[PDB]
Design a protein around this nucleic acid. Structure first.
Ligand code: MG
Length: 212
DNA sequence: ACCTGTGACAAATTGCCCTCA
DNA sequence: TCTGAGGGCAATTTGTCACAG
DNA sequence: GACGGTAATT
DNA sequence: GTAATTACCG
């Protein structure tokens, strides 16, 4: 049974923009940190490859490009911004990377919490769908069901959706339908929704879900 | 003015392949 | 030989906007 | 490369 | 021969 990720709701609801590969590495960082500290973490190529069913080559490529793409990225807890890394990554040994996560982020990871096993998300491809599945997990019940109403503006400002998704039909076509379909096809969750409106504008989305 | 969907195009990401220390 | 660090790819998804309703 | 089984040194 | 201990190939 796969590693059980837990995280403060403050991270689930933080504002940031990360890719799938970056979020994948971040889950392992959160696991290492939580089992305790100083903030220095490590990643092995071959273990990453085995965890996510990748080749060693493509694992290496994903880690390397994720790592150089962290530079300049920031995290916002609502309203305080932090950088993820305070030193570049570096490799002491072949197939091994050592990273220095901002230790000031530690209390935000481990505190009103969200939890899910890593097997639930490791087949999701779209990072916004990972964000949505995390935000739904935050409200999940022991038995595996839940219901929550999310505001559209808060979704856009938390997941940092691109500007053209401020037009609602593109929001529907390229974000909502795709990420719900991904969740329904790639996780053990079964998800439905309905739109809440005020005048002509749609203001919230109401999600209901159960477990298979 | 506002709202909805679709058709097109561009830009980015995916799982691939090959090569060599 | 097994790893992994590079160099590429075509097919697919994601981001953007004109247009008709 | 790095490692590890193999042959080849002394 | 054995048994300790180094260079090379896949
Ligand atoms: Mg990859």
């Amino acid at each position: 049974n796969s590693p059980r990720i837990v995280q403060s709701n403050d991270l689930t609801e933080a504002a940031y923009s990360l890719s799938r590969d970056q979020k994948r590495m971040l889950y392992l960082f959160v696991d290492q940190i939580r089992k305790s500290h100083d903030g220095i973490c490590e990643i092995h190529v071959a273990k990453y490859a085995e965890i996510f069913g990748l080749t060693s080559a493509e694992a290496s490529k994903d880690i390397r490009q994720a790592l150089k793409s962290f530079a300049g990225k920031e995290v916002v807890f609502y309203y305080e911004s932090f950088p993820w890394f305070i030193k570049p990554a570096h490799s002491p040994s072949r197939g091994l990377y050592s990273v220095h996560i901002n230790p000031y982020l530690i209390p935000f990871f481990i505190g009103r919490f969200t939890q899910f096993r890593l097997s639930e998300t490791k087949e999701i491809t779209n990072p916004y769908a990972m964000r949505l599945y995390e935000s739904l997990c935050q409200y999940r019940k022991p038995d595996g069901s839940g219901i929550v109403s999310l505001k559209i503006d808060w979704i856009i400002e938390r997941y940092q959706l691109p500007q053209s998704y401020q037009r609602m039909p593109d929001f529907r076509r390229r974000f909502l339908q795709v990420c719900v379909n991904e969740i329904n096809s790639r996780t053990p969750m079964r998800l439905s929704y309905i739109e809440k409106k005020k005048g002509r504008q749609t203001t919230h989305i109401v999600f209901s879900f159960r477990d298979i």
